């Protein structure tokens, strides 16, 4: 339903913000240097490098998901935000009415001028001697 879709959007937003914050905080925490005990410097360093790269990838993925959320929200607004549909419909209607009225005024003035010319031509043609 509409409620269900809006809830789902809320869930996605909360999840994305939470993920960006958590990944950044975890990267900062690993960035701490600590004294080693039973971790074998080389292994500890490679594991830390992998963790940082994976977390950065996760942050980028969360940003892409936030872009997807913004796109979905834009689609919902363009499709069913009733006020803006009403202002678009009304503006379209008023513009088309003004164009119709301009066309009809042009046609009516054309008819009157053509009618006066027709009167002159009728007098000339019917009163021709031949």
């Amino acid at each position: 339903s509409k409620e269900t879709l809006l809830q789902s959007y809320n869930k996605r937003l909360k999840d994305d913000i939470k993920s960006i914050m958590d990944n950044f905080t975890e990267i900062i925490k690993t960035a701490k240097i600590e004294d080693e005990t039973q971790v074998s410097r080389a292994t500890q360093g490679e594991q830390d490098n992998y963790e940082m790269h994976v977390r950065a990838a996760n942050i980028v993925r969360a940003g892409e998901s936030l872009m997807k959320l913004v796109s979905d929200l834009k689609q919902f607004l363009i499709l069913n935000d009733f006020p803006s549909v009403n202002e678009a419909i009304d503006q379209r209607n008023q513009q088309l009415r003004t164009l119709q009225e301009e066309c009809d005024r042009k046609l009516i003035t054309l008819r009157d001028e053509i009618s006066i010319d027709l009167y002159e031509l009728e007098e000339e043609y019917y009163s021709s001697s031949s």
Partner: peptide
Amino acid sequence: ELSAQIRYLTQVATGQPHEGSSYSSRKDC
């Protein structure tokens, strides 16, 4: 911003397909 817009979208959602239109004026034009 996103929480405010989800709230505003919650206020003006209906789940109904908006039976208004502007077809007749385009036809007359």
